[PDB]
Amino acid sequence: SKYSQDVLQLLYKNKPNYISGQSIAESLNISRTAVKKVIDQLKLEGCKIDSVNHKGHLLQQLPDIWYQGIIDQYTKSSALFDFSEVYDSIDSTQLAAKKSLVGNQSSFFILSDEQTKGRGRFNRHWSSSKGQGLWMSVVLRPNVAFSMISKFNLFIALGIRDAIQHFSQDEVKVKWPNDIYIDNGKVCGFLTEMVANNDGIEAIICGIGINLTQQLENFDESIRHRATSIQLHDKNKLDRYQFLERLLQEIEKRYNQFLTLPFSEIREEYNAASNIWNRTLLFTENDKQFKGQAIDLDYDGYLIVRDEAGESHRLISADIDF
Numbered sequence: 066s067k068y069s070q071d072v073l074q075l076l077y078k079n080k081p082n083y084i085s086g087q088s089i090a091e092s093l094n095i096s097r098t099a100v101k102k103v104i105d106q107l108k109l110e111g112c113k114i115d116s117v118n119h120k121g122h123l124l125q126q127l128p129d130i131w132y133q134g135i136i137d138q139y140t141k142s143s144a145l146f147d148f149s150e151v152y153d154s155i156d157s158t159q160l161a162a163k164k165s166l167v168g169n170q171s172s173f174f175i176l177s178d179e180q181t182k183g184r185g186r187f188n189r190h191w192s193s194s195k196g197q198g199l200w201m202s203v204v205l206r207p208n209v210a211f212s213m214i215s216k217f218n219l220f221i222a223l224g225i226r227d228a229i230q231h232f233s234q235d236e237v238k239v240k241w242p243n244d245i246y247i248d249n250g251k252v253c254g255f256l257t258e259m260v261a262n263n264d265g266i267e268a269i270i271c272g273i274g275i276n277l278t279q280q281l282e283n284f285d286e287s288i289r290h291r292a293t294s295i296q297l298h299d300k301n302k303l304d305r306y307q308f309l310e311r312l313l314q315e316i317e318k319r320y321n322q323f324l325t326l327p328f329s330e331i332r333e334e335y336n337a338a339s340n341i342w343n344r345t346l347l348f349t350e351n352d353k354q355f356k357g358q359a360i361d362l363d364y365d366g367y368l369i370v371r372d373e374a375g376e377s378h379r380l381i382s383a384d385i386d387f
């Protein structure tokens with residue numbers, strides 16, 4: 066009802082202690098009977114709440130659904146994000162973020178259980194099924210020149226990779242510049258956009274799509290051989306909250322590095338984490354396509370490639386297939 070999020074927030078805020086119905090009733094100023102109705106509704110939606118007479122209620126486990134009340138606890142304690150917008154469905158978190166940043170200097174992120182019109186690089190369709198992935202857009206306000214956009218994309222890749230790697234038994238690798246893999250399966254795609262002028266950056270908008278709990282049968286039949294999810298590499302059930310918590314952790318860690326470190330300081334770390342070496346890569350450049358081999362990521366984030374004809378390229382960004 067009107068108070069599901071408020072009750073949920075109290076149940077979460079009180080872990081691991083039980084909270085009595087009277088206590089919830091007095092803090093939301095609603096009847097004992099209303100409180101039980103809300104608790105019954107939360108359990109209906111998949112919340113695991115233990116209820117004990119004379120003692121109260123204890124949130125044990127949330128379902129595979131984003132709840133604004135819970136996410137409000139994360140932003141409350143965050144030293145980076147002012148707020149967040151949580152939706153069950155939306156056309157795109159990226160479209161929503163680009164609209165919400167206008168006219169302010171807030172830092173925030175937008176979460177949606179499903180996207181109706183998810184878009185990747187080059188306006189590609191991004192599947193954003195309900196209940197199976199993290200579809201998030203992040204808006205930050207770095208006081209840096211606009212050329213720094215490429216460096217942000219490099220620092221954030223290691224952040225996303227680190228959070229995923231924490232939950233995966235198999236190695237998680239970055240595919241420069243915008244994709245993350247677990248073995249041969251893509252588990253994440255991200256992209257960094259900006260609003261800027263000559264005097265600097267007005268906002269960074271980072272759209273992050275992560276496959277959390279798909280089963281192989283849930284991926285398309287065509288892409289199934291090169292698509293994976295975190296759950297497919299975690300012996301334990303994957304918890305959306307637990308993952309989001311570490312993902313926000315790492316984004317903040319890598320965002321402070323971005324502001325304080327040159328790319329030289331993470332470059333070596335970035336190479337050990339990339340899966341683009343010692344292999345034929347296929348490059349797309351508008352109309353042209355060609356094969357080549359990645360030689361190095363230089364000190365400035367540029368990939369150095371020796372193409373099939375022996376010629377060299379130095380690319381700030383590329384469209385790479387395996």
Ligand SMILES: O=C1N[C@H]2[C@H](CS[C@H]2CCCCCc2cn(Cc3ccc(C(=O)O)cc3)nn2)N1
Pocket residue numbers: 157158159160180182183184185186187189191199200201202243244251253254255256272273274275288292
């Ligand atoms: O609209 C929104 N965008 C963002 C936020 C939440 S998601 C987030 C999505 C951004 C994706 C950026 C990375 C990317 C990769 N590619 C090529 C590609 C993509 C999928 C497959 C596949 O078969 O899986 C294969 C190749 N394009 N773009 N909201």
